[PDB]
Amino acid sequence: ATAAEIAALPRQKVELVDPPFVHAHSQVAEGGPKVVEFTMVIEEKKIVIDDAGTEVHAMAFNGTVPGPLMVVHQDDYLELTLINPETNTLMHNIDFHAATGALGGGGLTEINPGEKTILRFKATKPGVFVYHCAPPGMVPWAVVSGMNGAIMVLPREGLHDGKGKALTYDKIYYVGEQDFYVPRDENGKYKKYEAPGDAYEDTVKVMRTLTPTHVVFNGAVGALTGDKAMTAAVGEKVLIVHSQANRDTRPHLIGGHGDYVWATGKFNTPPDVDQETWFIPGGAAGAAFYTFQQPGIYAYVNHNLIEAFELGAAAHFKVTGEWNDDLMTSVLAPSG
Amino acid sequence: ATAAEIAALPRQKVELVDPPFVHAHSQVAEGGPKVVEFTMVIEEKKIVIDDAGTEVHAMAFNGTVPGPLMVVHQDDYLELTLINPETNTLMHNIDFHAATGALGGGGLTEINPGEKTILRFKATKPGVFVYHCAPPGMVPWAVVSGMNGAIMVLPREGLHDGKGKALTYDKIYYVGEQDFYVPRDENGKYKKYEAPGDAYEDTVKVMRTLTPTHVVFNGAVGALTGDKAMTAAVGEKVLIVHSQANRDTRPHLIGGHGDYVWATGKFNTPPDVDQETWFIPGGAAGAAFYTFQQPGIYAYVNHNLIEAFELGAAAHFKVTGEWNDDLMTSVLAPSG
Amino acid sequence: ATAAEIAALPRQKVELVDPPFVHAHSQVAEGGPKVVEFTMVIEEKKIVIDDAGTEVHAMAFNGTVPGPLMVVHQDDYLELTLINPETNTLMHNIDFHAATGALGGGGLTEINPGEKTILRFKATKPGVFVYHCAPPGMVPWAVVSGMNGAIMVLPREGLHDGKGKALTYDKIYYVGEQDFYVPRDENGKYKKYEAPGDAYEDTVKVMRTLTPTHVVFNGAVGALTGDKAMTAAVGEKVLIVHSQANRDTRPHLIGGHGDYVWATGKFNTPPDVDQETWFIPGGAAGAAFYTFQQPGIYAYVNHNLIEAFELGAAAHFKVTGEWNDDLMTSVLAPSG
Ligand SMILES: [Cu+2]
Ligand SMILES: [Cu+2]
Ligand SMILES: [Cu+2]
Ligand SMILES: [Cu+2]
Ligand SMILES: [Cu+2]
Ligand SMILES: [Cu+2]
């Protein structure tokens, strides 16, 4: 691909939307290779992550935890303008697991407060991939402070099953999973700090126990439940992209399955099928395709149930439609 | 299928056997779709999990930990009669990962002590699946108190390898692995309680450490050893179903291998081959097929060896037959 | 084959080399089946695992942690002469996950100090496999004290991808990952012991937390960095064999990918492709094949980033060559 050919490719700016929702995109590529442009402003800010007012000084791409899902197609280029406002206190950068070279982009995007940078990379491999901050010397701290997200590089011709049959989803959601390590005082109460740096020592100590105090979806316990449950209808095909930048997770749709699951998150690797519970290793993203068949409220969780129900890794799906008694029926209701 | 068509299907009452054994069944479907009937009584009882007399208040389906393995074929209907004796003190239900709708059946099977219920679901996906109690707000507690098992939904035409060659086993064993979280007093001694509800607060604190005090097969340290070691003979084909409803595991047959391993536990996903150690995520069941080629004692373990030899995750296999010197021989026995 | 036929086979004595290097071998087997001979002397020795000077009484095959990588081809016989010098104090043996029978050879190789033994086994299955000490009663202690390594059984026709295309690497490295559990005093300082036995009780207590104090490559924090960093060049094809005999790991090449990854380590199981982060469960070895495309420094880590950067699981690659601006380019360097 000559130098002229690359400079001639069309440039297209895209407006990002906050997770679990995903920005406008087409499953099958529209036109030839493009340079897809995105801009994200980094925000350091205190967020409350549970019903007890527990705080964390989050480091958030685009102001959200997880950062937004960026979608492009194989062989498109992703051109990110990353802005670090002077109001922030730390140097930040970004590592796209989808990219090749300079530590995923980290070595070329180190920006101090008051600086911005523009990185471009060719998305040569199809699949969902994690992206995260990675300042040399404090990589895990930045990541476990919520500075991570994922992108999806769709095959130019959309998704397909193991047999080559097309798999077109009606809706897509991005569930970013986050392990937080919040310090506690001797009485067991979560501590609060004035500035991000103040919590550093105490936090690394908790991190070393390899035991998170919270494991959440969309940045807080219950963020994807109640009135914020994701939605679908019977017959609707849904793609659920799930990521975990630092620690293993095992997604499970309670009352459902993963009809096709690219557990490694890479589309050239044939998807597993009829999954009850899939596995995504820390530092990766995966994707599950399911066609809902029963209406009702479903729970979507990390299937180490303590992490799901004691630590916060549980989301909900509200599904409309008609019940199918062939698939399931209460022959005899609960009775003495 | 219409309600009328289902009602016209033949019914077959199966009698369950305690793990690791599996009730009589046929690998290849004997005739068209039928309604396979099972009955299980919930028993809240005390179990001793180690040689130090450590106790756990178990919540056991059919009186055992794990609950028994139920076997049907794809597209059969599994009709479960679940009974919660008045002697029990808690509400219980059942979520079948193999089922579709109402949280796996959990939403339609909540039964208080003194009640019973009958659930019927269609086994549309082939493979081994976990089933476990899941009372709202009490989910992980019940599961880690031993209330879980698995079922196997065989393909109508039995098992096959990745190329369609049939795989027929001579024996089948079901190993249910359980992570227990037993509270300790200020002297490191495990605590005992006179009531299930009495140990709740103490147990949740331990559960939050995400560090089990015990990891066992069939409910206790050494359960599947000695009088309970599994058996086989050189030349015999054996399928080992293994589940873990709450935490990851990595099975390994010491001295052998997993010739064919459906690691995700789903039969429409080709099995991995020539496996040394496979992986099953918390919340799932998997299955390995192996043809013994050497006689002698074998150990079967969760290969985090601390979990296997310090925490209790180890079982034994006694194999009869002639030793094969081509495969292995001691050229020079241990000597000066 | 009969004893006579085995005795007639040619024999080749191989000289082992220290990890991450691998002894000379041919990817495509040259000639028919051979009895490949190896010799390893077990050394119980004190090793320093971090910059602070933390000590561990290692139990090391060939004097290194991990033990060296032995390479044979499918259906060759691996004949190991194992020596336990009289200067040692413990009985040792070896379990080859690649072998069939007697606990992987463990039951035939128990040698006391001052003894030796010669074990021979047929390498019937292709792939990388863990080997580790396993004296009944102290199995995990030996392994987490560093007594483990791996072997590679190459297909006689060399490596191929999932579709029959040959995969020939230019160089190979073996990364053995070790989880250590070092006791600490009341000041949180690592403790030193005069003899290995002295540390047993304290170490077992740490092991039970299932939380290693160190997670390292090639025996120590930073062991594969600086002048010991691995090397490659743009266009070079590298195979990275990775093992972990006791605990899970999720390898990731920062700045690159795993073009083909036999995550399970078994060559007859098609490899995953375009991987960002793969997963190797405790008790197994895996291998990733990658063709470098960008020059510069890369980090190779266990992608639970706390384990990589706080606990020690990080290695570096120095790659020579021309930068590819098509794959990645800084449109705008960090600036105001
Ligand atoms: Cu940052
Ligand atoms: Cu990363
Ligand atoms: Cu229950
Ligand atoms: Cu479940
Ligand atoms: Cu040893
Ligand atoms: Cu082993």
UniProtKB/Swiss-Prot annotation, chains A, B, C:
- Supply the induction statement: Under anaerobic growth conditions and by nitrite.
Q: Where does this one sit in the cell?
A: Periplasm
Q: How the cofactor binds, per note?
A: Binds 1 Cu(2+) ion. The Cu(2+) ion is held by residues from each of 2 monomers of the trimer. Nitrite is bound to the Cu(2+) ion site. Pseudoazurin is the physiological electron donor for the Cu-NIR in vitro. Binds 1 Cu(+) ion. The Cu(+) ion is bound within a single monomer.
Q: What is its EC number?
A: 1.7.2.1
Q: Which cysteines are joined by disulfide bonds?
A: none
| Any Pfam family the entry gives | Cu-oxidase_3
| One GO term describing the cellular component | periplasmic space
Give me the segments passing through the membrane.
none
The cross-references to Gene3D superfamilies, in alphabetical order and at most eight, read:
Cupredoxins - blue copper proteins
Taxonomically, which superkingdom? Answer: Bacteria
Q: Where are the coiled-coil regions?
A: none
**Positions annotated to bind Cu cation 1:** H92, C133, A142, M147
Q: What class of enzyme is it?
A: oxidoreductase
Q: Which InterPro entries match?
A: Cu-oxidase-like_N, Cu-oxidase_2nd, Cupredoxin, NO2-reductase_Cu, TAT_signal
For the ligand (Cu cation 2), the binding residues are: H97, H132, H303
The catalytic activity, as recorded, is: nitric oxide + Fe(III)-[cytochrome c] + H2O = Fe(II)-[cytochrome c] + nitrite + 2 H(+)
Cofactor dependence: Cu(2+); Cu(+); FAD
Q: In which pathway does it act?
A: Nitrogen metabolism; nitrate reduction (denitrification); dinitrogen from nitrate: step 2/4
Q: What is known of its domains?
A: The type I copper site in NIR plays a crucial role for electron transfer from pseudoazurin to the type II copper site of NIR, which comprises the catalytic center of NIR for the reduction of nitrite.
Family of the protein in this entry:
Belongs to the multicopper oxidase family.
Q: By what name is this protein known?
A: Copper-containing nitrite reductase
Question: Which species is the source of this protein?
Answer: Alcaligenes faecalis
